[PDB]
Amino acid sequence: AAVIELGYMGISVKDPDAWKSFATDMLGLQVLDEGEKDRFYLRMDYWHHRIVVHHNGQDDLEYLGWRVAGKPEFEALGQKLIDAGYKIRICDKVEAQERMVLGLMKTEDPGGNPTEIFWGPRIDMSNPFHPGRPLHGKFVTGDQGLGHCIVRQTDVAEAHKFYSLLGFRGDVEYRIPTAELSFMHCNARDHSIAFGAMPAAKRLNHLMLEYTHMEDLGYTHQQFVKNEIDIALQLGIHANDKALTFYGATPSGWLIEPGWRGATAIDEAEYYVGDIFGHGVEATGYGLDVKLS
Amino acid sequence: AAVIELGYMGISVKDPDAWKSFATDMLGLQVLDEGEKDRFYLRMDYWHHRIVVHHNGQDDLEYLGWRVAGKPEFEALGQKLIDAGYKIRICDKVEAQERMVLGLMKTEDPGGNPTEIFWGPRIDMSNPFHPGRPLHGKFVTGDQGLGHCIVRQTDVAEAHKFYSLLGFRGDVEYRIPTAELSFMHCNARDHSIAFGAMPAAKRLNHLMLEYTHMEDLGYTHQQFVKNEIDIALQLGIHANDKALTFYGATPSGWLIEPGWRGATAIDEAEYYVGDIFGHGVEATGYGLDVKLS
Amino acid sequence: AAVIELGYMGISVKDPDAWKSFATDMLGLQVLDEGEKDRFYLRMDYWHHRIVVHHNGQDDLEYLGWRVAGKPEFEALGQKLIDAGYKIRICDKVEAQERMVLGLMKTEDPGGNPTEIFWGPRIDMSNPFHPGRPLHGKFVTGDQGLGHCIVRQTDVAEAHKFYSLLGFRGDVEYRIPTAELSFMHCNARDHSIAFGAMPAAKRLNHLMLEYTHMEDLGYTHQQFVKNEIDIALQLGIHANDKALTFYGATPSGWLIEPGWRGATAIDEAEYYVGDIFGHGVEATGYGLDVKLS
Amino acid sequence: AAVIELGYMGISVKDPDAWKSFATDMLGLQVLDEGEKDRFYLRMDYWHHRIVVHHNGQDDLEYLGWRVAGKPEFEALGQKLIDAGYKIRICDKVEAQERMVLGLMKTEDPGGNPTEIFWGPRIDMSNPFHPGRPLHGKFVTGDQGLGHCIVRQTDVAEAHKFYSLLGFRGDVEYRIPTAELSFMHCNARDHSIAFGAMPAAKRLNHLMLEYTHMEDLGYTHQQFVKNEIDIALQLGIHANDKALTFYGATPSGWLIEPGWRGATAIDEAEYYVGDIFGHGVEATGYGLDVKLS
Amino acid sequence: AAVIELGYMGISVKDPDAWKSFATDMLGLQVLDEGEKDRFYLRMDYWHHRIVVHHNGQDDLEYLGWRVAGKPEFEALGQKLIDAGYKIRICDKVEAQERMVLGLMKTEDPGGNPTEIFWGPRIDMSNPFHPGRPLHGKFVTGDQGLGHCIVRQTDVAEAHKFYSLLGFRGDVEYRIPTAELSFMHCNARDHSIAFGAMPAAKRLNHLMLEYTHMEDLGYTHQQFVKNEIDIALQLGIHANDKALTFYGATPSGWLIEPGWRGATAIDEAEYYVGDIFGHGVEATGYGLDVKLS
Amino acid sequence: AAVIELGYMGISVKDPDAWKSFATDMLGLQVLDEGEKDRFYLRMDYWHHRIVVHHNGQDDLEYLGWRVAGKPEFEALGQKLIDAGYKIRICDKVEAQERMVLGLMKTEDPGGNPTEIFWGPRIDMSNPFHPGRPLHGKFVTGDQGLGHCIVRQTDVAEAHKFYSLLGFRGDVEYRIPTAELSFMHCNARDHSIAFGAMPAAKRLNHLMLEYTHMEDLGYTHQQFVKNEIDIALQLGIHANDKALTFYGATPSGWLIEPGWRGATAIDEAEYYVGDIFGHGVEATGYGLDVKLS
Ligand SMILES: Oc1ccc2ccccc2c1O
Ligand SMILES: Oc1ccc2ccccc2c1O
Ligand SMILES: Oc1ccc2ccccc2c1O
Ligand SMILES: Oc1ccc2ccccc2c1O
Ligand SMILES: Oc1ccc2ccccc2c1O
Ligand SMILES: Oc1ccc2ccccc2c1O
Ligand SMILES: [Fe+2]
Ligand SMILES: [Fe+2]
Ligand SMILES: [Fe+2]
Ligand SMILES: [Fe+2]
Ligand SMILES: [Fe+2]
Ligand SMILES: [Fe+2]
Ligand SMILES: [Mg+2]
Ligand SMILES: [Mg+2]
Ligand SMILES: [Mg+2]
Ligand SMILES: [Mg+2]
Ligand SMILES: [Mg+2]
Ligand SMILES: [Mg+2]
Helix, strand or coil: CCEEEEEEEEEEECCHHHHHHHHHHHHCCEEECCCCCCEEEEECCCECCCEEEEECCCCEEEEEEEEECCHHHHHHHHHHHHHCCCCCEECCHHHHHHHCEEEEEEEECCCCCEEEEEEEEEECCCCCCCCCCCCCCCECCHHHCCCEEEECCCCHHHHHHHHHHCCCEEEEEEEECCEEEEEEECCCECCCEEEECCCCCCCEEEEEEEECCHHHHHHHHHHHHHCCCCEEEEEEECCCCCCEEEEEECCCCCEEEEEECCCECCCCCCEECCCCEECCECCCCCCCCCCCC | CCEEEEEEEEEEECCHHHHHHHHHHHHCCEEECCCCCCEEEEECCCECCCEEEEECCCCEEEEEEEEECCHHHHHHHHHHHHHCCCCCEECCHHHHHHHCEEEEEEEECCCCCEEEEEEEEEECCCCCCCCCCCCCCCECCHHHCCCEEEECCCCHHHHHHHHHHCCCEEEEEEEECCEEEEEEECCCECCCEEEECCCCCCCEEEEEEEECCHHHHHHHHHHHHHCCCCEEEEEEECCCCCCEEEEEECCCCCEEEEEECCCECCCCCCEECCCCEECCECCCCCCCCCCCC | CCEEEEEEEEEEECCHHHHHHHHHHHHCCEEECCCCCCEEEEECCCECCCEEEEECCCCEEEEEEEEECCHHHHHHHHHHHHHCCCCCEECCHHHHHHHCEEEEEEEECCCCCEEEEEEEEEECCCCCCCCCCCCCCCECCHHHCCCEEEECCCCHHHHHHHHHHCCCEEEEEEEECCEEEEEEECCCECCCEEEECCCCCCCEEEEEEEECCHHHHHHHHHHHHHCCCCEEEEEEECCCCCCEEEEEECCCCCEEEEEECCCECCCCCCEECCCCEECCECCCCCCCCCCCC | CCEEEEEEEEEEECCHHHHHHHHHHHHCCEEECCCCCCEEEEECCCECCCEEEEECCCCEEEEEEEEECCHHHHHHHHHHHHHCCCCCEECCHHHHHHHCEEEEEEEECCCCCEEEEEEEEEECCCCCCCCCCCCCCCECCHHHCCCEEEECCCCHHHHHHHHHHCCCEEEEEEEECCEEEEEEECCCECCCEEEECCCCCCCEEEEEEEECCHHHHHHHHHHHHHCCCCEEEEEEECCCCCCEEEEEECCCCCEEEEEECCCECCCCCCEECCCCEECCECCCCCCCCCCCC | CCEEEEEEEEEEECCHHHHHHHHHHHHCCEEECCCCCCEEEEECCCECCCEEEEECCCCEEEEEEEEECCHHHHHHHHHHHHHCCCCCEECCHHHHHHHCEEEEEEEECCCCCEEEEEEEEEECCCCCCCCCCCCCCCECCHHHCCCEEEECCCCHHHHHHHHHHCCCEEEEEEEECCEEEEEEECCCECCCEEEECCCCCCCEEEEEEEECCHHHHHHHHHHHHHCCCCEEEEEEECCCCCCEEEEEECCCCCEEEEEECCCECCCCCCCECCCCEECCECCCCCCCCCCCC | CCEEEEEEEEEEECCHHHHHHHHHHHHCCEEECCCCCCEEEEECCCECCCEEEEECCCCEEEEEEEEECCHHHHHHHHHHHHHCCCCCEECCHHHHHHHCEEEEEEEECCCCCEEEEEEEECECCCCCCCCCCCCCCCECCHHHCCCEEEECCCCHHHHHHHHHHCCCEEEEEEEECCEEEEEEECCCECCCEEEECCCCCCCEEEEEEEECCHHHHHHHHHHHHHCCCCEEEEEEECCCCCCEEEEEECCCCCEEEEEECCCECCCCCCEECCCCEECCECCCCCCCCCCCC
């Protein structure tokens, strides 16, 4: 029994209108508004949603939702967490329905990040993805889940223990002149969660979303430049996942990492002291002032 | 040890002559009459038969025959069922020979549906399938077994427990505005058995048979229309298996679901609130008045 | 730990000169004479040999040599046989060297057939196979071992227990109007050993050797016809392995089954009541007077 | 938990300048000098290095570095070695940093060869391999590690026990008229370590490095001939790995075996009494005066 | 008979030392100096050279060398040019040897650009490409020739007539708000020559060289940024060839266009009014101040 | 209409017994003796023969036999040769039958080498190739014909004109420090005929035969070394065809070039000044004292 993907994430925001325009125009995500007073959804694929956007918010992560294959794996992982001393709560039907899942449990990772484990997402096969702007392609999701994030941790060894229990694999992959960053995978995506020991004002450092087409990544980069949105780290290729990516500001102040061409996760641990090219610092103050080239 | 396919099914009918004409002309199945006073066979492939048609009957399912790989799996599953508290009977040679199998056991699922577990079907490699009408292609069988059915259940959780013990995987896949339907697989066929909590006059709701060719599905649909046979649900594509199918009346009053292009089963649970298109209700009273589009 | 192929076989013969001419001209095997007074070898591939031909003999099987992957599997299987009550003898270096293997043990199957289990065959990569007559192709060996045989058994259930312990899988595959024949596999070859309950004057009923090319099978058949050698069963295709084969007399009186186009073994048990075509009886008295078509 | 590749090796040399010229001109390896007073590095691929060359040395092997997938396998193998009675030392951060690995332990094989087990090599993805002379291709490394070696052993059975514990598989593959040589694999490379019982003045008999291109192997052979460097064994093809190789003197007196076209390791043990062609003795005194053709 | 590739080009430069450092460090080309007083060579592949760099020069193009398949095509094209009224000179052996070709003719295109047509380039298969800095990959050459250029033309219709006679195909592909640019191909490279009506101080506007690997393109871009070399047009993707490219200053003042992922030429004419993304103007004065996004 | 392969060759020899042993043991060719007093045949494949060996001979080439597709191409090429001023003779049935072809014409190339053009070779599909020694593989023939040769020419331009008329393509490919050698192809074999201006005592310089397997080439090389047969040029790889080959003496004094891994012919002319590696001179006096490395 193990987590198999980053299924969904919840964020809260102070400016929902800015977020709708940002998500659609700058990224190509689809806005779905179900008429709820306090939230809307962002789509990437056939799932009803991948991101829940809550308003009256704190401009930060609200929860990560990690999928397991089914009820037997849900029950086994729950018991594993209990046996290891972690505190979990199995949610009732109302709470599961709020997330639009068949089964749901809530806990917190060792860094304080609200963590949900679920099975049975709602897939709207009748409602194909329709991007918020014209796209050459689509997003890479499927068995790789929605993307990845770096989140704050206060104790890297304890974080690693928790994510290992959940079925993730990975360790320190960068020693940057020394800062150490750890990257963990639960499927073919090179990593789904990553972290280090750096102090951080927010739970969320960045969210990476992956395009199928280089043309969409480039156009997104151009949208950031034309609209004069801060780029924290310039275009570059990571040594671990081999993806072409950049990092730009969101209206909430944490970063989005649009990217293209991520490689398959490997179980064999290796480490690097820098990236392949690029990812030079441009705008500062976003929690990623590392020297990568 | 696990069930690996829906190997055969037995039905009983009040009008065997109507069933011969229906099976051959409307569906393209092959009638095999071995001169027995009380039954004949329907073929789909090289197996001696896939369906036994008993006459002097009740116009309903008589038994489902689930295959295991061999004697060791047969013996292991038998003991598993006994240990879990289910009542089984290991059949003698005469009874096994009646079904034309090397080993046979009989039991009943929690909904009262007679359930057989066997190994070693008779394959007539010398006698290739010869359809009851001209076909462009053939049927999809092989590792996927003969097809799938929905059968009546009175306790969904108990049904799920039983089929899980037998090696099936699956859960609720549709929440239709709320009706919940569960679908379970034991091989690459998207599902082989499915059920929900709806009251039903018959054990059998429908049997799905899959053509290799769209042209045969379309011609079958045309045969139903031309002969003015009730179509309960119109052409459409299911969100789970992605197959193009419709549902038509059989002479016994339960439905046949001829189809084409079923997708591979997945172990990762998801659910839907509707189909991709179609499957609108036409004729009523057949136990499937759900809103799928 | 399991047997992985029929590695070699030993036979003894009354007329070694006739056997050399037969093996080369009629079958295309390669004769290798190492100058030993009491034996010579037959080759099929890069192995030093696949068949040892002893002279001053009884015109029957002397031993079957079953390969395991290595020493750990050899030791594990030896202990398994001991624990189950079978009598084995681990051979010393001289005896292992006689067979040209790294490790050797000797036992007897429940029908009295001398049975050897070994690891580490001698492969003469420096000495490519050179057939005893011109061939269009070569033999099918590799992961499938040298071929298959039917051998005499006195207790089918005990035979099955023994071969199952050794890692073989399979059961009754033919019910011929009733005679039952069992076929067991230990690799991709449809079967490597088979048996039934019929009385037999010899340990060996037949040995099947498989050509890569239909042209070589046909030419071999023609050689039997032209030289007026008894054909016991005519050309035909088996329902289990789908191979085109015939059965002809050897100088020792047991049969050779030259063949072509054998299918991959399947773990799922099925049975047949006849072959696909052919295999009609021609010459009688060879222990295979079954009705296969 | 098992060793997955020969990750690195350390050697010590009396003439570092001769080694730089040899490695670059004769073999095409890349010299990397980090300004350390007592060592330099040789590269083959993206790894920071594959060979450490220590100076003020003994012209022999200093250590073999065997990789495991990650920390869990490192910890499991360490405990396995302890439980079996072997003496290991888990290294501190300074020592791990010396080797540029995330975790390191040191021990000695039963023949006295210093043996290191590590996880997390440093990969310089920013610094692609740049050969020390023009090459048509590159080296075969990746999942196959850097190459293979024969090292001295005093007790073959004890050596085999040790490498088996580490996850290697293999046994005697040559009986050369009798000398027995054992070859063990831990990945797809036909073998990564090999040994026999012959007396040897040095720990290291030879190191084999594999080119992707035959043209580079041939040019290397020509470089040895033109520069009048001793060739111990002439061009030939091995019966086990099917590679085209020759053996030439290094400035340290042990042999390099440049090669091309190695086959995939097999778990099924076989043995040979000679090679496919070539590998005739030319220069003597290098510890490989065997008759291979 | 037709031109099949841009085989070589000659340039002349005022600062050969700056060009050596630029070509090697910034681009990864290989410098080959044959000891000639007035020139050196740049390599990209197995050809003896692709670019001749003459010194005591004008910082501009000296000649384009267009390859034909062999002598029959050389002779046919020569006669075609003569028959159409163009002035050509068939070169003697000394002149052909200067270019290291088997046959050579010299002419001038309608814009005054010295144009050479040749067959039989010198290929140094013994001397594999060795880049002037470490590269992840190599260059795209082969059937696509060395790259492409834009050169000055004074009469677009006459230029088109000339290149059409030589076997090129293509027409106006961009109408940029109106400036019209024409692009012509002679092989699978999307184009090998292009031109428009804009006034130009130099014969050569830019030369495009294509990497096999995105990582090398990105590293080259980084080298331009780090060394503060003018980038005329920023990273972007062309609508015609779909390549990712940027344009940077050379020491001669004309531009290099390093790129990656060019698409196959198409014979069906289409046109665009802008690029896919990027190629925004940065540094001005380089003859490409067009609005492409 | 064009020649499509080197179909057969005739040689005459002073020592037929030495030639039988040489061809079989040293090369693996098959000797076929039809009981004719003055000749025997050598086979490589299903053709009745590829080489006719005449005795009472001159130890040189007697004729090259070039195949055309059929009668229409035979008639067209005959008329082409006549129209161009060459002297041909269309052979009668007896003469065609001597060569075992359906149609035959005889002429002489400009260097005096007897040249035959034919259609309709005799293929003995009933008699598969059986090599004169054990082989790992077979020969490369099929659409590539039997091999290639260098033959004497007195006027290279006239030779080129003749072979061009016959449908061959090619030109000078080596300028060896200056000696120029021309190589011409008529199918996918890199070349089938080659020549230069060097004086030669014999019509035939060498015949190249190509193995499918490197192992057979290496074993052949070893046979030459062990039997102390002159090797004129050592193992090496040609820059044009990329084949691994060496050149050894035949009993007739001209050379055989056994080889492996020839590349596909290219229509685009290029030239080289040396080989990739090897082909160093060993034994002299065989008409190939060129410097190739
Ligand atoms: O996705 C990533 C891969 C590698 C990284 C390496 C260092 C910082 C951030 C990184 C990141 O977001
Ligand atoms: O085969 C099926 C797939 C999905 C279904 C969904 C809802 C009702 C029946 C269904 C069915 O027969
Ligand atoms: O190889 C065989 C396959 C099937 C058989 C079925 C019945 C008798 C002999 C058989 C046999 O030798
Ligand atoms: O790599 C090798 C393969 C086989 C061998 C067989 C005998 C000696 C050395 C050998 C070797 O270095
Ligand atoms: O390679 C190119 C493709 C398209 C272009 C379109 C407009 C200007 C330059 C271009 C170029 O160099
Ligand atoms: O087959 C050949 C290819 C290239 C050659 C190049 C120079 C001499 C002989 C050659 C030859 O026999
Ligand atoms: Fe990231
Ligand atoms: Fe259904
Ligand atoms: Fe058989
Ligand atoms: Fe070796
Ligand atoms: Fe361009
Ligand atoms: Fe040649
Ligand atoms: Mg990772
Ligand atoms: Mg399902
Ligand atoms: Mg079987
Ligand atoms: Mg091995
Ligand atoms: Mg174009
Ligand atoms: Mg050529």
